[PDB]
């Protein structure tokens, strides 16, 4: 009955039938995106209407459409034709990936390049990558993918070990034309294999690891009701899933005595960009928007008990649409479990004689996605003490190139002749805040150093200052780790028992933001990634920091255009957008498969409660 | 047989007998520090000599002594009288703590101050705190403690909830004189209790937490031999314990095929300082050097199975000396166990069809200490992939004051009338490096942004630069999170298979360093805390960043005097000293007992191995 429930197979089948009957889903049409729309603000009238947003692509060259459908009423609400040279192309379709390799295999220029290198076309895999927007005027309004080649010596070989450098092709996937083949010269194809399950490479497996058994003899402490509503240790939330964003958390609230207190209305990773820093023309166009261009949710893994998720695991299996509108279940795509998290609080008091120890735990909600060579885990954590944390885990196989004779300033060497270009992995968390309700404000908090002198005669004092961000034009902020800079989201109309506004503090990891030149194409298309924090006024249609149609969009969409409205954000319904990422200079230890590296952020209560919220935790 | 074995009770009893027979341990003497000396460089002659360093205090006013004893030979090696006005006082003795409250209870000025506040002297607890060096000329060469008062309403009451502000006393603990009593005015004593085990405050305990059972049915994967030598998943190390530093890690090495490769010769937390930022004269002198002044190892907790350490736990029970030279065992003072640590590496490959997942784990070595109101956990972690990490966990009860009517820029309000002064908790990790041997160097690595232009026509390139630190005078470095600054410790004479020097990268958390004015007493005495990284040339007697005798030392000892030697550190036996800490603006949620907060650092391999070192991990 909850309006935040997961999309059902029946809902998706109804959408398919509504689109078909309306004449919108002929044999030339493909669904490039389908997802449920969140309830509009002020849905306290019970008039629930399950609506779906659909992007429809046309493989014959006709204009695509954006369509909104009401499943409850069985009607098309709106249908708009899209001019993609203006507003951007639709996300990449899974079926277009195979098109690239097939088209190149019959192109005379591609075959000549492979022949010069003595490569059998049947062994050459082509990575189909998003195109971006660069200098090629003929690409405007066309759906382009770019292809880079890798050799697979046999069907189970890791092709990533054998990049074919000096060669790139561009393909129009609608007209099925190879537009350009660029060959800048022959590089040796690195010969060592990268097969991390081959005993020749692994050696004998260790026999020294004894099992660790994690069990819950009475079952888990959380409950799941209505399919996706979770209650755990005073937390309450709904777990959503969207094919673009992946796991989305709704209605995060904390039961403080008799009051259910809201904290975050909607939390998601709303974009992620992987820009490459190699100036070679073979790769200088390479930038993945995994969320906006590829849709990370549709490549979610099925997670295996004991391997991917260990302990007493509760799974959700979200349903998405395939390209024809058929429901597709991602079996065991979301893992939920609680974990012990060490000591929560401890004190041994000499004067009172009381020894006190309590243990901490966290609730984990996670999924994993695979896009080409990279695999990313998305982890949300809720802690007993009111802390909320996000962690991204990056693994998989690094993207490779040749390593040039005489070295490189922009590529690491991993093996003889094998390089890995420098790159970043940058995320945008969209936090639709609701600290004790929707009237919120953001303050920037810096440490303040004080000079020795009158009122500070021993030169020991230090302080802090808070600056309220009052309008969107002043709410684009940078990190400053040296001054301990954090941001506080507070509710000025809800006070704790000391008459201070209740709040939560955002702690960033203070990693570098986008490194590209500010005049570059990627800086324009991923403007969100150039700054650590943005605050906007909530609006229904401002969903993604990069805009709705990221693929081959010329730039400036999303956050830079939103904040030009210069809206009041001082005690209003606001959204925090936090940029955070990893800068990856690959090391030898990342090859042939990369150990996990992590980045994230957390929010901790700041006078939200009237005292510690974990005094009622028992001594187990 | 190992020279790095823990001190035994028999060794400490022999030291006592040697000191007594030599006439050095009469009834007026107290042992303020006793610890084993590490083997000198080049102990490959098997001529092992177990030597102990002892600081001997004299309660009658005679000069203290530093003494070195050989247990194996039964001899006093050296004994030097100390001029404490020059070189610093000895660490605080546990028995001097009680002296402060007892002396004040009979002092006319103290009793008048308590009478004005209608406080029963029998209910007033006095926190005995280190004195530092300030403006009082009569304190030079005397052992001073300063006392702050708290009311205990009944024997099990938390006195920290009831600070007596406006009042401080200074006590000479050798002559047993109260030198000064300062009363700046009457503040109301905050009346609310802070008793976190009282049902009136906790409410009914939760019944919702179901058990998490962590067991190892075949026992742990590590082995312990010779009392303190650990082998675990290719790691090899010795776990030491010193009464000043606590847990010390020796001889950290990694078994890479047939080679045992050294990484770190000695790792320890060699100082920790807690400076307070309240300019009130009642507290503006307040700075704890928990390691150097109090000795954190002697206040180590006995850790309880199931509460402090959960899982299959192996304990060590280190032995220390009491003030009379009797051995004292800290039962279950060190916990060791392995923990599951999520996904280690994962990839699902479209082209090869191979799905691959491996799990990570870490080895944990930890102890907890309690000094007055604060409790600190020290955690060392070893990971399968070669990562070494340290984490400090801070909990306990925050130090309190009155909250002034009309507010404060330097104190948080926690409860009606109850304040908590701003402060920091700053640690110094001393890392005696041995990356593949003792010839090491440090490079500072910054990200390099590049301008769009020739050779970078699309403005996407970025790079990095490394600067070798060649002499001690250039090896005092600051963090720069915006440029992704890290430090690499490498061995220029040991190369990986790509002919690059092997190395490890230090990743800092980039938290603020010491905030006090640089002209302050604390900035002079804790100079190490003003900079993030120091590199020195190894020397036997350069053990602590603050010098040997920190208590009431006037300043400048330790690292600033060491680096004035300006020694060669480019491919030499070097020591890295890393400053890291927490800046604590107390929140309401920290009261009445503080949930754990953490800070730390980690080191990751950087071309140390020829490929990923965890290819031989099995699929469990
Ligand atoms: Cu990467
Ligand atoms: Cu603190
Ligand atoms: Na456009
Ligand atoms: Na909001
Ligand atoms: Na002196
Ligand atoms: Na060294």
From Swiss-Prot, chains A, B:
- Could you say which residues bind Cu cation here? 423, 425, 584
Question: Matching InterPro entries, A to Z?
Answer: AGAO-like_N2, Cu_Am_Ox_Cu-bd, Cu_Am_ox_TPQ-bd, Cu_amine_oxidase, Cu_amine_oxidase_C, Cu_amine_oxidase_C_sf, Cu_amine_oxidase_N-reg
Q: Does the keyword Transmembrane helix apply?
A: no
Recorded source organism is Arthrobacter globiformis
Provide the E.C. number(s) assigned to this enzyme: 1.4.3.21
* The protein's name in its UniProt record: Phenylethylamine oxidase
Q: What class of enzyme is it?
A: oxidoreductase
Q: Name one Pfam family in it.
A: AGAO-like_N2
Q: Does the keyword Transcription regulation apply?
A: no
Task: Name the residues that bind substrate.
Answer: 288-299, 371-376
* Keywords for the protein's UniProt record, in alphabetical order: Copper, Disulfide bond, Metal-binding, Oxidoreductase, TPQ
The protein's role, per its UniProt record:
Catalyzes the oxidative deamination of phenylethylamine to phenylacetaldehyde with the concomitant production of hydrogen peroxide and ammonia.
């Amino acid at each position: 009955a909850s309006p935040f429930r997961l999309a059902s197979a029946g809902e998706i089948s109804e959408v398919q039938g509504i689109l078909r009957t309306a004449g919108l889903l002929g044999p030339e049409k493909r669904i490039a995106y389908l997802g449920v729309l969140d309830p509009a603000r002020g849905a306290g009238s019970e008039a629930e209407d399950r609506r779906f947003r659909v992007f429809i692509h046309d493989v014959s060259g006709a204009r695509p459409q954006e369509v909104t459908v009401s499943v409850t009423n069985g009607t098309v609400i709106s249908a708009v034709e899209l001019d993609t040279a203006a507003t951007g192309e639709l996300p990449v379709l899974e079926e277009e990936f195979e098109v690239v390799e097939q088209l190149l295999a019959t192109d005379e220029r591609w075959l000549k390049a492979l022949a010069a290198r003595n490569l059998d076309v049947s062994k050459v895999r082509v990575a189909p990558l998003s195109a971006g927007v660069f200098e090629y005027a003929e690409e405007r309004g066309r759906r382009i993918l770019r292809g880079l080649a890798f050799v697979q010596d046999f069907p189970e070989d890791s092709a990533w070990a054998h990049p074919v450098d000096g060669l790139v092709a561009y393909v129009d996937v609608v007209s099925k034309e190879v537009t350009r083949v660029i060959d800048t010269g022959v590089f040796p194809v690195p010969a060592e294999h990268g097969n991390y399950t081959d005993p020749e490479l692994t050696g004998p497996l260790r026999t020294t690891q004894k099992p660790i058994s994690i069990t819950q003899p009475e079952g888990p402490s959380f409950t799941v009701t209505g399919g996706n509503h979770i209650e755990w240790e005073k937390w309450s939330l709904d777990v959503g899933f969207d094919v673009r964003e992946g796991v989305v958390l709704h209605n995060i609230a904390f039961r403080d005595g008799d009051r259910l207190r809201p904290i975050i209305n909607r939390a998601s990773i709303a974009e992620m960009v992987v820009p490459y820093g190699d100036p070679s023309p073979i790769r200088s166009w390479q930038n993945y928007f995994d969320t906006g261009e590829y849709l990370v949710g549709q490549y979610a893994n099925s997670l295996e008990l004991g391997c991917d998720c260990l302990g007493d695991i509760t799974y959700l299996s979200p349903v998405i649409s395939d390209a024809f509108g058929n429901p597709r279940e991602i079996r065991n795509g979301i893992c939920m479990h609680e974990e012990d998290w060490g000591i929560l609080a401890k004190h041994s008091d000499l004067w009172s004689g009381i020894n006190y120890t309590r243990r901490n735990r966290r609730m984990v909600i996670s999924f994993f996605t695979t896009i080409g060579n990279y695999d990313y885990g998305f982890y949300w954590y809720l802690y007993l003490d009111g802390t909320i944390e996000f962690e991204a885990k990056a693994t998989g196989v690094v993207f490779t190139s040749a390593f040039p004779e005489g070295g490189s300033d922009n590529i690491s060497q991993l093996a003889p002749g094998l390089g890995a270009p420098f790159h970043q992995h940058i995320f945008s968390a969209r936090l639709d805040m609701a600290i004790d309700g929707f009237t919120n404000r953001v303050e920037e908090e810096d440490v303040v150093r004080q000079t020795m002198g009158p009122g500070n005669e021993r030169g020991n004092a230090f302080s802090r200052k808070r600056t309220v961000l009052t309008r969107e034009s002043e709410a684009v902020r940078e990190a400053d780790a040296r001054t301990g800079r954090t941001w506080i989201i507070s509710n000025p109309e809800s006070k704790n028992r000391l008459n201070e506004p209740v709040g939560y503090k955002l702690h960033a990891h203070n990693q570098p933001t986008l490194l590209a030149d500010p005049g570059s194409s990627i800086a324009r298309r991923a403007a969100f990634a150039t700054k650590d924090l943005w605050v906007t006024r909530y609006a229904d249609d401002e969903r993604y920091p990069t805009g709705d149609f990221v693929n081959q969009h010329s730039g400036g969409a999303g956050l830079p255009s939103y904040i030009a409205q210069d809206r009041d954000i001082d005690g209003q319904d606001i959204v925090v957008w936090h940029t955070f990422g990893l800068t990856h200079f690959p090391r030898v230890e990342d090859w042939p498969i990369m150990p996990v590296d992590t980045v994230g952020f957390k929010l901790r209560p700041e006078g939200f409660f009237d005292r510690s919220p974990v005094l009622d935790v028992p001594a187990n």
